Symmetry: C2
Subunit: 983 residues, 2 copies
C-alpha cells in the first residue's frame, strides 16, 4: 500500500481547493498551501496514522527530491519563455543574473555572519545566500504580461529569474559539497578543473542532448505521444546523466535544453506544442504544490522546535536586509544596464526590486539542507528562515506589487487600446442585439425566457493656419501607423507573415509612433535582413575549402573508430590484428588512388608504413567527412536569418501597399496625401531594392526560402479548401481529418527541407514561366527561338520611347524601371518585361537600367507574333498571355474598390485567378451582364454600355449600374474583358 498516492492526491486536491477558493483574494495560493501543510503537519504530530502518511512521504531523501522536482521546474521555466525577447536582451539578463546573484550571495553571506548569533563560517553562509538569492516570480510575470505596456520588463524578469535559479542551484551545489558531503583537500588545478567542468560542461551537455532531441523530434510524424514522451524523457535523462553519471551541472543542462527546445519549436507539430505547453505548466503546478505542502509539513514537524524570538527578529531584519540588498544591487548595476539598448528606468528598477518572489526552488534547497544536516540545528534554522521569508515575500511582495504597479502608472490602459476594446464591445453589443432580434422571430424558440437570456449575454467592457496644418499632419501620421499595424495583423492572421516578422514590424511601428515626426523607417528595418556576420565568411571559406567508394572508406573509419577507444588479452588481440592489417593497408591505398586532400591521405599511409598514426588518420577522415555537414549547418543558420529578413521585408512591402490603398478615405488634405504617399513609395522602393540585392548575394538560399514559402502557401490554401469542403457538408469529419493529417505531415516534412536549394539553370527558369506552363511543343519553340543576352552594370537595356521589340525574362541580376507613367520599380529574377508592349503593340512605358550584372532572355517580337499565329488550341498562347497581363492590370482596380471590405491582396488575387477572359469573337461582339457574373473588368479597348448611355475607355471595373456591354470593332484595339462568375 503506497501512501505516496494518498499524500500526492491529497496535495493535489488541497491545491485545487486553494486555487478555486482564493481567486478573488489577492493572497497567493502557495502561502495558504503552506498553511494547510502546517495544519497537516501538526495533525500528523498528534495523530499516528497521518504521522505514518506524512512520515513516509514528507521525510523524503534529498537526492530523489532534487532529481524528481528540479528538472520539471527548471524545464518549465525555460519552456515558458518567449525565447526571442530573451535572446534580444540576453546581455542585460545574463550580466544582471550572474553578477547580481554572486554579489547578492556574498552580501547575504556576510550579512548572516555579522548578524546571526549562530557561529556560521563563510561556506555555510554562502550556502545560505545561494538559497536566499534564488527568486521565482510567476505572479509578477503574469501581472506584467497582462497589463499592456512594459512587456519587455516581464521577459527581463523571467529570464533573470531562470538564470538566477540555475546558477543559484549551481553555487548551492558547490558550497554543499564544500560543507556537507565531502570535506576533501585538492590542489588549485583540480579546483579550476572542477569549476571549468561544471560551468562549461553544463551548457555543452545540455546543447548536445538538445540537438539530439530536436533532430529526433523533427523526423517524427503522426504520433503525438512519442513527441511528449521524448520531451519528458530527454529532460529527465539530461538532468540525471549530467548530475550523476558526470559531474556536469545538471540544472544548466536542463536550462540550455529547455531554451533550445523552446527556440526550435517549429520541429514539433502545433497540437503537440499546445499540449506540451499545457502539460509542462501542469507538471510544474504539481511540483510546486507538492513542494509547498511538504515544506509546510516538515517546517512544522521538525524546524519549529528550535525557533526563538531572536530568530523571529532575525527573520524580519533579514527580509528587510535582502530587499535592501537586491535594491542596491539593481541600483549599482543601473548604469551598465542602461548602457544596453533597453535601459531600465527607475520604475522598472523598482518593479524588479520588489518583484523578487522567493519560491519552490529555494524551498527545495532548504529541504535538502534540513535533511542533510541531520540532528544538527543548522538545517532547522535554514528551513525556518527560508520558509518564513517565502511566506513574507509571497504575502507582502504580491499584494504590494499589485498596489505599486497601480501606483507607478505602469498599470494604466493606453488610449488606442481603450478605443479598440470599446469599439469591439460596441460591435459585440450590436451583434447580440441582432441575434436577439432574429431569435425572437423564430418559430421554435419563440417562448424562451428572454430577460434571462439578455442578462446571460452581456459582454461588458473590461476597462469600464499653420498650427492646425501640423495638427492634421500629426494626426495623419498616427492614423497611417495605426493602419499599418492593422495591415500587419491582417497579414499574420491569414497565414502570410511569420510570428517574429509580425513582432518586429509592430515594435518598429510602436516605436515610430512615439517620436515627433518619424514614420516606420527603412534603416531600422534593414537590421532584420542584415545577413552580414561570421556566417557568410564561414560559408565562403568552406566552399573554397571543398572546391560509393568514399562511403566505404567512411564506413571503414567509423568501424575503426572503436579500436582507438580500445587501445587508449593476447596483447589486445595482437593489437586488433595489427588494426585489421592497417585497415587492409588503407583499403589497398584507396585502390591505388583509384588506379592536397589525397596528399594528406598519402602522408597518412606513409606514416602507417613507417597508434598516433591511427589517431591522425581517423581525425583526418572525420574532418573530411564533417566539413560538408558544417557547410549544411552554416547554410541552415543563414537560411534561418534570411527567412526572417525576407518575411519582414514582405510584410513591410505588402503593408505599405495596403496603407497606400486605404489612404484615400482616411486623410483628406491633398498636400498631406501627396507627402505621405511620397514617403510610402520611397520606403517601398528602397526595401524592394535591398531585397533584390539580398537575393543576389546568396542565390541558392534565396531560392530555398522562396520554395519553402511557396510550399507553405499552397499547403495553407489546401488546408482552407479542406476546411471549406468539410464546412459545406460534402466531406465528413473523419475523411477531412485524414486529409488534414496528410497536409500536416507534408508541412512537417517541409520544415526539414534542404536549406540551400541549388539555383535552376536559365532553361529551367524559361520552362516555368506562368504563360508558358505546359505545352511542350511551345516550350521547345520558345527555347529554339530564345536568345540569352548579357548586360553589365549601368548599361541601359530598354529605352522609354522606342518601339516594343521583345520580351526580357530576367534570369540573373536586378534591374530598375524608371518610367513616366513617375513610375519606379525594381524587377528581379523570373520577371518578364514587355508583355504588354508585345501584346498591345504600343510604344513602351518605362526604361530599364541594370543595377547589377543582368542576364535576360530576348524573345523577339516577330518570334512571339508567329508564336501567337502558330498555337491556337483551346488554351491558346494569346489567351494565356492576355490572362497573365489581365490579372496584373486588374489587381489594383479590385484592390482599390474592395479593400474597404477587409480583403487582402492575396485574397484579391485568388478571387481574380478563378476568372477567365471571354471569347468576344463568339457572341456578336456584345456581352450581357446577368446575375451570374460577379466582377467584370475591361482590360483593353473602348466600350459602350446598355442603351449607349455613355462610353468607358479605360482599365476600369464595370459598375453594377451597367447591364449590357456592346463592343465596337476597329483595328489596333481588339478588346479584352475579364469576368468572375459567382464562386
Amino acid at each position: 500500500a503506497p501512501k505516496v498516492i494518498v499524500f500526492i492526491s491529497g496535495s493535489c486536491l488541497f491545491g485545487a481547493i486553494s486555487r478555486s477558493l482564493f481567486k478573488k483574494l489577492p493572497i497567493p495560493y502557495t502561502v495558504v498551501l503552506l498553511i494547510l501543510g502546517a495544519i497537516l503537519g501538526v495533525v500528523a504530530s498528534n495523530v499516528p496514522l497521518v504521522e505514518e502518511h506524512t512520515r513516509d512521504v514528507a521525510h523524503m531523501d534529498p537526492h530523489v527530491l532534487l532529481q524528481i522536482f528540479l528538472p520539471v521546474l527548471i524545464f518549465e521555466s525555460a519552456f515558458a519563455m518567449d525565447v526571442h525577447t530573451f535572446m534580444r536582451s540576453f546581455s542585460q539578463v545574463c550580466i544582471l543574473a550572474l553578477f547580481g546573484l554572486v554579489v547578492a550571495s556574498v552580501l547575504t553571506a556576510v550579512l548572516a555572519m555579522n548578524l546571526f548569533n549562530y557561529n556560521w563560517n563563510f561556506s555555510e553562509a554562502m550556502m545560505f545566500g545561494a538559497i536566499m538569492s534564488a527568486t521565482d516570480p510567476v505572479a509578477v510575470v503574469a501581472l506584467l504580461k497582462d497589463l499592456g505596456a512594459s512587456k519587455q520588463l516581464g521577459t527581463i524578469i523571467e529570464g533573470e529569474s531562470l538564470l538566477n535559479d540555475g546558477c543559484a542551484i549551481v553555487i548551492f551545489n558547490v558550497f554543499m559539497k564544500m560543507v556537507f558531503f565531502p570535506q576533501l583537500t585538492s590542489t588549485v588545478g583540480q579546483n579550476v578543473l572542477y569549476f571549468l567542468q561544471v560551468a562549461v560542461a553544463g551548457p555543452l551537455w545540455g546543447y548536445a542532448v538538445a540537438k539530439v532531441t530536436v533532430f529526433f523530434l523533427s523526423h517524427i510524424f503522426n504520433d503525438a505521444l512519442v513527441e511528449i514522451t521524448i520531451t519528458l524523457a530527454a529532460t529527465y535523462l539530461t538532468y540525471y546523466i549530467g548530475d550523476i553519471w558526470l559531474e556536469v551541472s545538471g540544472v544548466l543542462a536542463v536550462v540550455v535544453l529547455g531554451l533550445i527546445v523552446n527556440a526550435e519549436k517549429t520541429s514539433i507539430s502545433p497540437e503537440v506544442e499546445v499540449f506540451l505547453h499545457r502539460f509542462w505548466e501542469m507538471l510544474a503546478y504539481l511540483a510546486n504544490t507538492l513542494i509547498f505542502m511538504m515544506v509546510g509539513v516538515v517546517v512544522t514537524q521538525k524546524a519549529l522546535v528550535a525557533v526563538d524570538k531572536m530568530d523571529w527578529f532575525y527573520l524580519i531584519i533579514l527580509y528587510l536586509a535582502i530587499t535592501i540588498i537586491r535594491g542596491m544591487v539593481i541600483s549599482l548595476f543601473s548604469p551598465i544596464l542602461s548602457r544596453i539598448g533597453y535601459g531600465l528606468t527607475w520604475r522598472n528598477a523598482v518593479i524588479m526590486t520588489w518583484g523578487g518572489l522567493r519560491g519552490a526552488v529555494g524551498l527545495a534547497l532548504a529541504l535538502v539542507v534540513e535533511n542533510l544536516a541531520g540532528n544538527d540545528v543548522i538545517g532547522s534554522k535554514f528551513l525556518f528562515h527560508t520558509a518564513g521569508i517565502v511566506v513574507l515575500t509571497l504575502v507582502i511582495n504580491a499584494t504590494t506589487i499589485q498596489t505599486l504597479l497601480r501606483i507607478l502608472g505602469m498599470s494604466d490602459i493606453s488610449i488606442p487600446k481603450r478605443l479598440a476594446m470599446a469599439g469591439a464591445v460596441r460591435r459585440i453589443h450590436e451583434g447580440q442585439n441582432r441575434t436577439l432580434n432574429m431569435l425572437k422571430s423564430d418559430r421554435f424558440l419563440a417562448d424562451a425566457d428572454w430577460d434571462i437570456a439578455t442578462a446571460a449575454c452581456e459582454i461588458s467592457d473590461p476597462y469600464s493656419s499653420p498650427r492646425e496644418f501640423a495638427d492634421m499632419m500629426e494626426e495623419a501620421r498616427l492614423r497611417m501607423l495605426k493602419a499599418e499595424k492593422i495591415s500587419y495583423w491582417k497579414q499574420f492572421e491569414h497565414g502570410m507573415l511569420a510570428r517574429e516578422a509580425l513582432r518586429l514590424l509592430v515594435q518598429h511601428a510602436e516605436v515610430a509612433a512615439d517620436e515627433k515626426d518619424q514614420f516606420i523607417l527603412v534603416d531600422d528595418l534593414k537590421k532584420s535582413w542584415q545577413i552580414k556576420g561570421i556566417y557568410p565568411w564561414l560559408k565562403r571559406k568552406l566552399e573554397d575549402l571543398i572546391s560509393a567508394f568514399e562511403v566505404t572508406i567512411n564506413i571503414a573509419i567509423v568501424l575503426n573508430i572503436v579500436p582507438i577507444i580500445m587501445e587508449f588479452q593476447k596483447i589486445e588481440d595482437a593489437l586488433r590484428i595489427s588494426n585489421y592489417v592497417f585497415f587492409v593497408i588503407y583499403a589497398i591505398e584507396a585502390i591505388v588512388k583509384i588506379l592536397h586532400w589525397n596528399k594528406f591521405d598519402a602522408f597518412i599511409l606513409v606514416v602507417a608504413l613507417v597508434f598516433r598514426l591511427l589517431r591522425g588518420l581517423r581525425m583526418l577522415r572525420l574532418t573530411k567527412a564533417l566539413i560538408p555537414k558544417l557547410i549544411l549547418v552554416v547554410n541552415g543558420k543563414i537560411n534561418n536569418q534570411l527567412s526572417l529578413g525576407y518575411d519582414v521585408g514582405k510584410g513591410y512591402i505588402i503593408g505599405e501597399e495596403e496603407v497606400g490603398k486605404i489612404i484615400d478615405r482616411m486623410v483628406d488634405n491633398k498636400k498631406i496625401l501627396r507627402e505621405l504617399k511620397h514617403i510610402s513609395e520611397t520606403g517601398r522602393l528602397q526595401v524592394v531594392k535591398e531585397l533584390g540585392l539580398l537575393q543576389r548575394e546568396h542565390p541558392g538560399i534565396a531560392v530555398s526560402v522562396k520554395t519553402r514559402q511557396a510550399i507553405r502557401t499552397i499547403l495553407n490554401h489546401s488546408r482552407e479548401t479542406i476546411h471549406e469542403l468539410q464546412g459545406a457538408g460534402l466531406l465528413d469529419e473523419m475523411e477531412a481529418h485524414k486529409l488534414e493529417l496528410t497536409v500536416e505531415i507534408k508541412m512537417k516534412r517541409l520544415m526539414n527541407a534542404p536549406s540551400s536549394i541549388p539555383p535552376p539553370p536559365p532553361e529551367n527558369l524559361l520552362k516555368n514561366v506562368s504563360w508558358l506552363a505546359g505545352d511542350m511543343k511551345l516550350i521547345d519553340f520558345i527555347k529554339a527561338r530564345a536568345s540569352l543576352l548579357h548586360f553589365d552594370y549601368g548599361e541601359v537595356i530598354v529605352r522609354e520611347g522606342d518601339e516594343s521589340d521583345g520580351l526580357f525574362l530576367i534570369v540573373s541580376g536586378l534591374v530598375k524601371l524608371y518610367g513616366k507613367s513617375v513610375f519606379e520599380d525594381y524587377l528581379t529574377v523570373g520577371n518578364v518585361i514587355g508583355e504588354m508592349g508585345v501584346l498591345t503593340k504600343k510604344p513602351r512605358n518605362a526604361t530599364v537600367t541594370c543595377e547589377t550584372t543582368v542576364q535576360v532572355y530576348f524573345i523577339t517580337a516577330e518570334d512571339m507574333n508567329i508564336a501567337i499565329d502558330t498555337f491556337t488550341l483551346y488554351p491558346s498562347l494569346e489567351y494565356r498571355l492576355w490572362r497573365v497581363v489581365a490579372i496584373r492590370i486588374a489587381t489594383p482596380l479590385i484592390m482599390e474598390q474592395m479593400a474597404f471590405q477587409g480583403w487582402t491582396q492575396e485574397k484579391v488575387k485568388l478571387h481574380l485567378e478563378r476568372g477567365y477572359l471571354v471569347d468576344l469573337a463568339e457572341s456578336h461582339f456584345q456581352f450581357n451582364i446577368d446575375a451570374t457574373l460577379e466582377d467584370v473588368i475591361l482590360i483593353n479597348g473602348t466600350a459602350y454600355n446598355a442603351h449607349t448611355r455613355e462610353e468607358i475607355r479605360s482599365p476600369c471595373l464595370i459598375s453594377r449600374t451597367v447591364h449590357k456591354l456592346t463592343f465596337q470593332y476597329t483595328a489596333t484595339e481588339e478588346p479584352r474583358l475579364f469576368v468572375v462568375r459567382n464562386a
Copy 2:
C-alpha cells in the same frame, strides 16, 4: 540517486524508438518492447550495473505496481469510450463481458487442471483463467474505427474489453485472496456479504466520487490545471480509498468513474477536454511501455529458469485452446446476442473471436502472481504462460486480424465514400493548380524551384418505361438521403445541432438508405423525443408530495447529525448535554409552530418528550430537506433527455427545409418531385405537431431548453464576431483572447443553468414580442387594450374567408393552420397570427383550429390601427411590424435563390436582419439601386423597373438587371421595399 528515473526514461526512449521504427511493419511495438526487455534483462543478468538498475525498478512490490498502473489503464479505457454508443448497446456488452468472462474462466480453469502437469487446484486454476480471459484490444479497435462500416462493432469490442478487464481483475482479486494472502475460514453469510460488498459497493463508490468530481468540475472557470489535477487526483484517490480503506472493488469504481466523467464531458472546458484526452492517452502509453519492459525483464530474469519443452507444448496448445474457447463462448451466446437490436453476424463473431488481444492488464496480474508466489514455481509458470500468450496473441492475432478484415469484406470502401473522397481530391487539385498559377505571377516568389514545390504539394487519393420510372424514383430517393445527410452535417458544423443529434439523424438516414423504398420516417425518429418513462411519474408524484427559519432548522439538523455518529467520557458529556437539551426542545417546538409535514414534526417532538427518537427526527428532517433536490435531479434528467429530443426535431425540420429548397435542381421528373415533396411535407408537419405537444407536456423544462439554446446561439455568434474582429485586424490577439475567455466563461456558466425555468406569465410573453421590444408607452397601450380569450379543444378560432379582425399572440396551447394558399402549419406559444392581415387589410389566408386548450390575446384591428396612428417615432410601429413580416416573407425568396452557394437558413436570416425598409415617402416614390445595395426584395405592391421595361407585381427578389425602381401610387397598396447594404 534514483535509478527509477533511469529505467523509466530509458523505457520511454525505447518505447519511442519502437514506435518510430516500426510504423510501416504490421508487427506491433509492444512485442518488440518485450523483446527489448528480454535483451535488457539478459544484459542485466550479466552486467552488475544494469543488474542494480533493473533490480531496484523491475523487482517492484506488487501492491504499489497495481496501485500505480491499474488506475491509469482502467481510466483511459473507460475515458476512450464513445459512451453513447456504449450505452445504446449496454445489454450485449454487459451480458457478453460478464457471462463470457466467467464461463471462459471456468473453461480455462478446468483446461489447466486437465491439461497441465502441475498439480494446480481449482482456486489457482481459476486465478489462471482470470488472468487469461482479460483481453486488451487497441490495434483491432483502431483498425475497426478507421475502416468505415461496422462502426458499432468497434464500440462493442471496446466496451466488452473494458468490462472484461474490470470484472477479470475483480475475480482475480477474489481468487488471489483465496490462494495467497489469507487462507481464512468463514461462514456463508460473510461470504455472500463479501460478494455483495465487492460487486455492489464498487460501482456505488465509483458513482459517488464521480458525481462529486463532476459537481466540482462544473463549478470551475478559467483554469485548466485545476481540472486536470482534479481528474488525476480523483482517479487515484478513488482507486486507493476503494481498494485499501474499504474492501470495495477499486477497478469497478474507476470504471464507473471514467464512464460517468466521459458521459458528463460538458462540465469540462473544450480545451481541457482535448488536453485530458491526449493526457490520458499519453499516461496509458507510458503505463503500457513500463509494464511491457518490466515484464520482459522479469520473464527473462526469473521466469525462464524453469521452462521446459513440455511447458512450450502447453503454451501453443493452451493458445489454440483459449482461442477455441472464446470462439465457442461467442457462438453459444450468439442467439441471445442476436435477439438484441444489434445482432452479431458471423463476420462480426469471427472478428470478435480473433480480436481478443491479451495485454498489459494480464501481464500485470501475472507480475503480481509471480512476485506473490515467492520462490515457488507457480508464479514462474504463470508469468511464462501469460507472457508467451501475450506474444502469440499480439503477433498472430494482429497480423491475421488485418488480413482477416481484408478477407471477410468488412474493409472494403463504400461507393459514396469513394465518390466523396475522389471529388474532394479533385477540389484540392484544382485549388493547388490555382494557387500555383497565382504564385508563379508574384513579384517576390517568381524564382522558386517550382518542380520541387509541385512535387511537395500532391494530395493524392488515399483510396487510389415503368422500369426506368422506378429507377429514377430510387435514384431520387438516395439523392434526397445524401442531400439530407449533407444538411445534417452542415447544421452540426455551424453550431446548431448537437453531436448526438447529428449521430442519430445520420444513422437514421443511413438505415433508411438500405431498404427498398423507405425514407427517414417519423415513427423511428419519435423515440428520440419519447420523454415517457419513470421520470415524469417521479416528477409528478414529487410535485404532488410538496404541494429563513427552515434554513435555521436545517442547519441545526446538520449540526446534530454528528452526535448520531458519536452515540452509535462523563457518559458522552451527559449525552451531549441531553442532545443540546433536545435541540433547544426542537427550537421551542419550531417557535410554537411559528406561533402532515408539521404533524410528523409534532409526533417527533412528542416522542422526544416521551436515541432512536433522534434518529427518526434527523431522518425526517433529511427527507424533508432532500425531497426538492430529488425533484431538481429528476428535472435535470428530463431536461437532458428533452434537449436531445428537441435537437433531433430541429435538425430534422431544418434539414427537410434545406432538402425541399434544393429539390428543384436535383430531381428532374415532375411526378417524382411532387410525390417526394409530399412525403417531406408530411414528415415536417408530423414532427412539428409532436414537438408542439411535447412542449405542452412539460412547459417549464421546454422553456429552460429553449432559453439554453437561445443563450448558446447568441454566445456562438458573439464568438464569431470576436473572430471576425480578429481577422480584420481591429483587435489584437490578447484583447480578443480576453473576450473569448469571457464568452467561454459564460458558456460554462450556461452549462450549470437551472434545469426548469418557470414559464412566464402571459403579460411577460406580451412584453417580449419582437415588434414590440422596448417602447414602454406602446407596451402599456397594448396591455391596456389587450384581451385574453380562452379556447378549448376543436373550436375554430379563425375562418379562412372572413375579414382580418385582429392579432392572436398564442400564450398557451397548440393550434393548426389549415389553408388553401394546401398550406398546413402548427403554430405554438409565442407566435402571432394575422400580422399580414392586419397590416395589408386583406381577408385572411388560413383557418386556425385548436389542437389543445389554447389561450390567445385578441389585439383588435381598431386598437392596432390607432396604435399605428399614435406611435410615429423614428422606429415606428408601422416600420417594426412591416420589418417583422418583411423578414418573414423574404427568407424563402433569399433562401430559394441563394441556397446553391451553401448558405443555411440561419445565415440567411442573419443576413436579412441587417437590412432595413427604406422610407419610400422620401425619395419621390422612386428608388435607384446603386452598387451599395446587395439584395433588394420587394415586399408588397406593384412595381415598374428601369425605363419602364416591364412590371413586377409579386413578392420577389429584384434581379441584377434592374437599375432603377419607379413606384406607382394608388389606394390599398402603399408598397414596401427591403434592402441590404453591402456588409
